[PDB]
Homo-oligomer: A and B are copies of this chain.
């Protein structure tokens, strides 16, 4: 019945979830919700009710092909102002994909787009100092890189407010984003139609004086090729894409076809930022290493190298679900690294060395790696080592001399 689906959607929206998974195995249907950063088994409904609510949810979507096509793959969107299922106000539009599984089974995936202090949410103080120098440059291009759940839009919206405040209304702030994101400056709104509308918006934005162009989700090769022209025309661009390690971004640019000469300019590129999101331990509900191993403590051999020398400073999630917080995790913090481009650093990458350029950036430019930033928060006890290893790789490969140098700078400040 459609009312059961409406109630499930309403109770799922208010739970602050990321993604919704519904799996059908022809005997029971499992519900999964990505609470914080991981999915959890919510409930197991029966098959007939699951099929009924799936059909009701698909038929109430504004995009339909007048058939369900169980054997085929389906995709649809549900938008605001056209919904008969009493859509909650905390969501504007969602996308839902139906995938067949096994014999007469379904796999519904929903992305659940939501609506929504000055700076340094989880960034290091060096990152904040670098951002201050980055915001003062009148021209250039900056890249924000990370996975799908890396919180790029939140960082862009936070930087936009700082740019708006600091410039004292001496520049024009125009931003283009088809899905609205709470309150934000000027904001501008099939797959082919959406791509054509995005192309028209990005080719009409340059007609006006852009100053700061503020695009989003540079997905097409021609779009980013046009964007790079405006980057060197004398504008400033703040865009985000999907990448990792803060150095494979140039590989993505070369895959898109931006040529070698455009990326050799140190003046054009102004900074690279790579960020990940990891669960943050509760400060009130925390236990030490001895208290953790006293009650079913299991720690791998490779992890003991990370916590070596700082056993007391580390913290672990608190079990038994006390009155404070929910499960020992409050929010989700950011582990980020920022690279300031240089002539020699860009020349090394342009030669395709992929080795000793990272060493040059880490030593000469006094940069900090993502693994180093993760280890620094591990020492401080802000996050758990178990989630840090599962989210960030190569943490155990940091040398002791590097660890001492990282700890000395944090201790002296």
Interface string of A342-370 (1 = CB under 8 A from B): 01101100001011000000000000000
The stretch of A263-271, A372-380, A405-413 in contact with B is A263-271
A296 at the interface (CB under 8 A from B): no
Given contacts A107-B186, A251-B262, whether A393 and B172 have CB atoms under 8 Å apart is: no
The stretch of A50-58, A83-91, A199-207 in contact with B is A199-207
What residues on B are CB-neighbors of A139 within 8 Å? 244, 393
What residues on B are CB-neighbors of A265 within 8 Å? 248, 251, 354
Interface pair B242/A234, CB less than 8 Å apart: yes
- Interface size for A (C-beta < 8 A) is 75
Interface string of A251-280 (1 = CB under 8 A from B): 110110001111011111000000000000
The stretch of A96-104, A119-127, A307-315 in contact with B is A96-104
What residues on B are CB-neighbors of A97 within 8 Å? 204, 207-208
Interface pair A347/B343, CB less than 8 Å apart: no
Instruction: List 19 extra interface pairs beyond A102-B187, A138-B391, A232-B252, CB under 8 A.
Output: A34-B209, A38-B169, A39-B170, A40-B169, A41-B169, A75-B204, A97-B204, A97-B207, A99-B208, A102-B189, A139-B393, A147-B233, A232-B243, A232-B251, A234-B242, A248-B265, A248-B267, A260-B352, A343-B355
Interface residues of A (CB under 8 A from B): 19, 21, 23, 32, 34, 38-41, 73, 75, 97, 99-102, 107, 109, 136-139, 146-148, 167, 169-172, 186-189, 200-201, 204-205, 207-209, 229, 232-234, 242-245, 248, 251-252, 254-255, 259-262, 264-268, 343-344, 346-347, 352, 354-355, 389-393
